[PDB]
């Protein structure tokens, strides 16, 4: 609810390049600056003879909003022999998936084709480039001697990637073994050490891979999406992957152990061709240190109130337990054909309430099919089914692809050091990426005491040149959890006997202000103590109004001056949603 939609950062790349097809963060060595990583897989590069090789751009947040290309590879197509090109980097879609861990940036080219070393083929084995600062290495675990469709020729390694917490890379290859799919995991120490620009098929000893199975499992697309998390309660991040065409297009999700590549748990879709497993994510949502599984089925069709089918997409929420089981619920999308569940980005604790939160995108929802991102908060019992914030697309669809706002996103990284994790949302159809900054959340506890409750018609006590008067005591306390100033300036308004509309007969007004309303600018400090203030209001005489039946409601209203509570970046805080309002009592 606290994402700033008033002033978001708008980053752009070359037009027609699918800028924003893959997004991620960048946090290098020590306490340095932070960056946005954006993929543009259809981008023309300067590579000799390479048309639309694609690139990954490093955009700076600090200021100026300027993007700089990351040089992963400047060379053209290597030759196996004279007039015999070895590889085809044109239209390789480099930057279709970008994943970053600390000072490491991993980008891949799923449509990279490679010619066999035995004969003249053009097989899309896929390749990745890894950058650990200066050194840039190549990574093609499917570029092997296991050629042809029966092998890894159409593996398309790097279609999806992720990092574990123990410096292992997780790669998905949907085409391996006649499109059975395959997961490959290698230690980062081995990837760079065993790299050799003169060796096209490098064999890694600590490689973990899903070996080939029976022919019935062909055309399954194992590795279509990936995510990481601990599930067997040991400490080693395990491998989760969607298998959307398994079980006769029912879709499945396979879980493998992150140590010896063994199947741990299975999920199965409940509707044919719902693409159960298109997107997956793993994050602990209910504060139990057990990572939880989120499976998107963007093509899920539900039944409407009128009995007609409607494609809305579905995400299943499965809460991990120590007893090994899973508590699974299902979350249906809101808009028809929006493909709710196409992208799922763990956000961390977006609002710093003690429970992680998550975003789910419907890239083709909203007006003019521009795109919507839904924000969901966690709680003790799990994920809140109702969204607390709706991110709207602003960019209309020029002829061709729709804006696809939300199609890829990544969270759980605090890019402005404001104490709250932020969110990058890619929209490749309009070649754009947008940074939404989380606003600080102010929790306010307001109090209102009216003593006495019963006002006598003639109780003269407070000094006056003496009339029936009473004390109005209102207390105010505020706090926040993040990087916010100490001094929050409040402007508080009080209205006596509001129930009487403008034109009626009023019966209350303060003693010295001589006015039914009193304004007061209030500087209070969060965290210190509750600051309270008393003041005296009185009732009018009996002969001035015959209306002694209309109960006199004392109304107290309070607001904040955000401008003096804003940050150096102009990020204005925001109140918690269930209790921001004013309060009322009555005498």
């Amino acid at each position: 609810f606290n994402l700033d939609v008033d002033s978001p950062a708008e980053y752009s790349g070359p037009e027609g390049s699918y800028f924003g097809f893959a997004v991620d963060f960048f946090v290098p060595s020590a306490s340095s600056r932070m960056f946005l990583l954006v993929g543009a897989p259809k981008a023309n590069t300067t590579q000799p003879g390479i048309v639309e090789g694609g690139q990954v751009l490093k955009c700076d947040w600090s200021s100026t909003r300027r993007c700089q290309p990351i040089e992963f590879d400047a060379t053209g197509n290597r030759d196996y022999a004279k007039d015999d090109p070895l590889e085809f980097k044109s239209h390789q879609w480099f930057g279709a998936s970008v994943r970053s861990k600390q000072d490491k940036i991993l980008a891949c080219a799923p449509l990279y084709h490679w010619r066999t070393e035995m004969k003249q083929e053009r097989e899309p084995v896929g390749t990745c480039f890894l950058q650990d600062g200066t050194k840039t290495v190549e990574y093609a675990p499917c570029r092997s001697q296991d050629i042809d469709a029966d092998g890894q020729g159409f593996c398309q390694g790097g279609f999806s990637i992720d990092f574990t917490k123990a410096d292992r890379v997780l790669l998905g290859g949907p085409g391996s073994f006649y499109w059975q799919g395959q997961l490959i995991s290698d230690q980062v120490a081995e990837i760079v050490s065993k790299y050799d620009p003169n060796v096209y098929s490098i064999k890694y000893n600590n490689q973990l891979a899903t070996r080939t199975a029976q022919a019935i499992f062909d055309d399954s697309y194992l590795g279509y999406s990936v995510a990481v998390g601990d599930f067997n309660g040991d400490g080693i991040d395990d491998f989760v992957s969607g298998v959307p065409r398994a079980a006769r297009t029912l879709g499945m999700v396979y879980i493998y152990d992150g140590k010896n590549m063994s199947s741990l748990y299975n999920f199965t879709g409940e509707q044919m061709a719902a693409y159960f497993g298109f997107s997956v994510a793993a994050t602990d949502i209910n504060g139990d240190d057990y990572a939880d599984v989120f499976i998107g089925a963007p093509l899920f069709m539900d039944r409407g109130s009128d009995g007609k089918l409607q494609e809305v997409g579905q995400v299943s929420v499965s809460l991990q337990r120590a007893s090994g089981d899973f508590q699974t619920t299902k979350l249906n999308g809101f808009e028809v054909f929006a493909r709710f569940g196409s992208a799922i980005a763990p956000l961390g604790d977006l609002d710093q309430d003690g429970f992680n939160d998550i975003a789910i995108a419907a890239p083709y929802g909203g007006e003019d099919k521009k795109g919507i991102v839904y924000i969901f908060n966690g709680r003790s019992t799990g994920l809140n089914a109702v969204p607390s914030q709706i991110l709207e697309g602003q960019w209309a669809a020029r002829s061709g692809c729709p804006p696809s706002f939300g199609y890829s996103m990544k969270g759980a990284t605090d890019i402005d050091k404001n104490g709250y994790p932020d969110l990058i949302v890619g929209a490749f159809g309009v070649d754009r990426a947008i940074l939404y900054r989380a606003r600080p959340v102010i929790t306010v506890n307001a109090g209102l005491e009216v003593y006495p409750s019963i006002l006598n018609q003639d109780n003269k006590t407070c000094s006056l040149p003496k009339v029936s008067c009473f004390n109005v005591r209102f207390c105010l306390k505020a706090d926040g959890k993040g990087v916010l100033p100490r001094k929050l300036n409040f402007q508080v308004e009080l209205l006596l006997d509001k129930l009487k509309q403008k034109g009626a007969i009023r019966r209350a007004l303060f003693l010295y202000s001589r006015s039914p309303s009193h304004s007061k600018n209030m500087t209070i400090s969060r965290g210190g103590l509750m600051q309270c203030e008393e003041l005296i209001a009185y009732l009018r005489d009996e002969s001035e109004f015959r209306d002694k039946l209309t109960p006199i409601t004392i109304f107290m209203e309070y607001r904040l001056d955000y401008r003096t509570a804003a940050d150096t970046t102009g990020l204005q805080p925001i109140l918690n949603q269930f209790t921001p309002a004013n309060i009322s009592r009555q005498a």
């Binding site: 085809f88 159409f154 499109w179 963007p298 093509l299 069709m301 494609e311 054909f337 692809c401």
Partner: protein, 242 residues
Amino acid sequence: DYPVDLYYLMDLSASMDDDLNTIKELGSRLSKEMSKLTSNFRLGFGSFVEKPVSPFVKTTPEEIANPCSSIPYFCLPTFGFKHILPLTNDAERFNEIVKNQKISANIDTPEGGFDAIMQAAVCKEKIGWRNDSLHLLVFVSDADSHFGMDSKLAGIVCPNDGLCHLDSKNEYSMSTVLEYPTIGQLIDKLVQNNVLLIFAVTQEQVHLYENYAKLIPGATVGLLQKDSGNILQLIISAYEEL
């Protein structure tokens, strides 16, 4: 007595050489019994294979013009969907087309059948659907079929709008540009045009496609045999109307 339109959608993929002669015996046989229960009979024809993009077809210069290479065999190149015959009364022209049909090829067992169904459904002009008639669409293939988001591997991420995209060659021109349609999209366009989709597959593919017919309203399933008069029993028992 009531007008009826019947479009014949044949799969020209590689896995259909063993079933080709059964399909031609289905064409001529269907081009006979239709004139029985009705006089207002017009039938059409269309063929499909697969989207001509990697990884579904090899991208080597020889296997593009001849995807049956390395076997070796001569067959037609890989194409998404070709609208050959608009539905008309001339039924002997229908037979002359099915006879000359040759096999094509690709790599991955499921095909782009849904692309052909979507283009034949929405195009009420280039196919020529009557105002008030029974729009029947016979679907024939001996394997599975690709649906939405499967073209992401090929590099196609623009969804299918469910519109008429037939060029001057009467082919699916926006096949390498648009994704495959989903079952939701097909359901949304088979009712706007009111089309009854008959699935005619092989034994091993019925248990799959029958669950598809459960989702798609009005769509039924059928089995392919040497005596292909079985699928004819569907249509005759589909003229019940009422």
